[PDB]
Symmetry: D2
Subunit: 264 residues, 4 copies
């Protein structure tokens, strides 16, 4: 009776479907896949990448950056929503090939440093190549690259270091407040009485109100389905997108229903 073999982290085929760079605003572009968000912000002093998706997406991300006229050495900063393999996967490889830095809070830094291993809920089942954080950001700290200011908003829940990023871009000169909020789900999490996360419910409830008050004109999520985005239709991608109130209120209803059946 041999010990069980290792099992790889497999996802849906739509999570790995490459797409051409879809434009969100004057300086914001989606360069990930159909069901994984990878935001690129082109500035006058360099590019900024928010999340990266699965670890095997490092090559696809570099191709879309070259399509936007962005050399590897032009990527200046990598920002993360939360350090899971399906979002912070190719961060290690992108640091070696682009010369970019990674800015994340302490909780995301320690999770990214160990490659998602020893997860509070998943253990070692979802492990990705480890990467180090070059700058530790605090709640509400502003990060500026090429004149565009990125403000961090801590929303602990899915991970202790979940962060929503807000910045103001333009749409043919007319400004737009973009808010890239993280996930608010808890797939298979032990919500009540978790020894690894005793204050989990208090963090989710405080994060639901944090998402509601985010300065936002266009909402984006790491998984586009959470905010009712459809990258496949291109022009009509942001047609039925949800607000910050609708996204937080819908996630709280699922949280309370999951918390209620957990006690059953």
């Amino acid at each position: 009776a041999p010990l069980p073999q290792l099992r790889a982290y497999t996802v849906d085929a739509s999570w790995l479907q490459p797409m051409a760079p879809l434009q969100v605003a004057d300086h914001t572009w989606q360069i990930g896949t159909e069901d994984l968000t990878a935001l690129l912000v082109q500035t006058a002093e360099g590019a900024v990448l928010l999340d990266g998706g699965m670890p095997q997406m490092a090559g696809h991300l570099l191709d879309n950056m070259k399509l936007r006229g962005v050399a590897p050495q032009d990527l200046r900063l990598i920002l993360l929503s939360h350090a899971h393999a399906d979002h912070a996967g190719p961060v290690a490889e992108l640091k070696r090939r682009t010369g970019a830095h990674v800015a994340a809070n302490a909780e995301t830094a320690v999770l990214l440093a160990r490659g998602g291993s020893n997860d509070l809920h998943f253990g070692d089942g979802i492990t990705y190549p480890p990467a180090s954080a070059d700058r530790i950001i605090m709640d509400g700290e502003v990060v500026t690259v090429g004149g565009i200011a990125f403000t961090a908003h801590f929303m602990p829940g899915h991970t202790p270091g979940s962060t929503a990023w807000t910045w103001t871009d333009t749409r043919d000169g007319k400004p737009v407040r973009i808010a890239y909020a993280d996930s608010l789900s808890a797939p298979g999490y032990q919500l009540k009485g978790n020894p690894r996360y005793p204050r989990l419910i208090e963090d989710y409830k405080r994060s639901f109100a944090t998402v509601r008050a985010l300065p936002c004109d266009l909402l984006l999520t790491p998984h586009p389905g959470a905010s009712n985005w459809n990258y496949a239709v291109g022009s009509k991608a942001s047609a039925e997108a949800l607000t910050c109130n609708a996204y937080a209120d819908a996630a709280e209803k699922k949280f309370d229903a999951q918390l209620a059946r957990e006690t059953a």
Copy 2:
């Protein structure tokens, strides 16, 4: 005109005055100096150390542990209030000579990993040898060593990873709730409008209420003067010690007065 020389972190002579192990409870001992707290908890499965003081105190700590019949390999865990040089100093040296592990939250871990350098308020002026954290603890997580359970209580303010530790010991069988709360001061900190700590005031106010509600029968602080402890008098050390309400209420008055004159 040569560049200025480096300056060492010098403290008062009382902070470096060795003392014999002063007993606090049946299993708790003070093995630091007169003005620096180093709590040792002897259990049936090993010893636990809370803080260590200045970096040059590693030799004095090992001597007092040997006086208590504790070999270096018997030290099982090191706990920290906050990762500053005057408390988490000899942590790196103690890990090499005792085989103990360090448990701290993410904010204390990233601060301990870089040896206090790049401080949010002090910069590189107070640098100590770096040490790594072996276990990342969350708010309210319980750590048990030899039957004694240590509960973490996050109180961000002095540092983002300030932690108060509470545990129940005995006094000749009669139990006692000990609460080792961290400092609540802000020496020379920019309280309002700090770009490195935008939510500093919100963290201090929330930490003041956290200290008030701590389960406590005997309060101890990293600096014994903050809780009106006097290690020099030995038997009368805990005579005029402050409560949790008195300690938090007195620190908030100084915080508001400092915040008021800062706006002046």
Copy 3:
């Protein structure tokens, strides 16, 4: 055309076949699987573990240690041959559950810190949970635990930080020089003109002579087949075991033949 899914590191079923602790000397025991070596050294002051095998072997290792009367807190030190997933796999999990420290050289430390990712020859195909090294050892440095001295012998080749460990045990009082040498193979390695390892051939040739001169009465390897060990037969396990000269001379013949056909 979706991007290819991730693939897990699968091995032979014999590499994951648990076995009872097989005795090697008075204080040395094999507690791994049939085709993976995990040496345990019981001393008067604690236990020492050399390698651990696949990452999913952490539970099996703790069971055999309990069979030998070794509690988790009794494991004092973990030693490694080279930081690959099939040997240094459960190191991260064993550190969290045993309170042991890890001693390895700089090259093994930086490879263990990133969980085998960014391998010089394998890339990210063989990734395991990352672990940190607590003590950096040099070539020829002696490590003593409970009176038994372990001497490190650098043999760079399979990995830049491959290390052979030698120590003197007994066999009913009669001493025996045990040498736990690392692998000398190069599976699919680019030997000549490797940009990631320009001095690869010089390191292998210098390592072949290092293995020949190792003080050895009984040779063991991470893979027992390399030294002609057969853990399955129990008593006759060390019957046809190879010497240090035979093991190094046979590995060099395969190295030269592989280097010759590589130029073809």
Copy 4:
């Protein structure tokens, strides 16, 4: 009798005397102090910095880079001779303000990661702010930035990760082979029978022959006095500079004389 206070790492005033950028070749510039070498290499795709000097030199280095028309974001890579405070000091601060990466071998990486603490010969007396390595280089590995190729040459002795860097620049089109070799001294080192460095003598002897065979037309050292450089005289700085043979042969005579009197 209080414990002794901490003492800062003080150096000569000439080690902290700022100087204007002195030109070495068409693309190589000295931007450090009079007695500390800080080489800057301006390419078409960015700048490369070799060493930095004392930790308090980060501001002076950025000023000279601005004089050479090099913005902070233009610094692409930082190379190190050995990770001591008087050479790798401002590396941590330069990474935060320039967005550059650090390339060093495993031994320099683990020494830079702990800020020079726990030195093999100095202990914790010479501690500097810690910095992380982004790329691990091997012996003879080539690093190219903007067409200029930097080849690493391991020369363990002063530190286990001492590295000499060689590259070919020009002098008005006429090429010149520059070799930036590390120090070969051992100030107060225990050469024979050192438990922290058992193979110290073998590494020094092998490093002396390594420096002799370095491809070199102009030699530079971290301390300009070792190679008979005089940055103060400007034009006549490289007048009486030593060769690679003269520098290695003079250092070996001092090594043997120091090794001889150590046995006395």
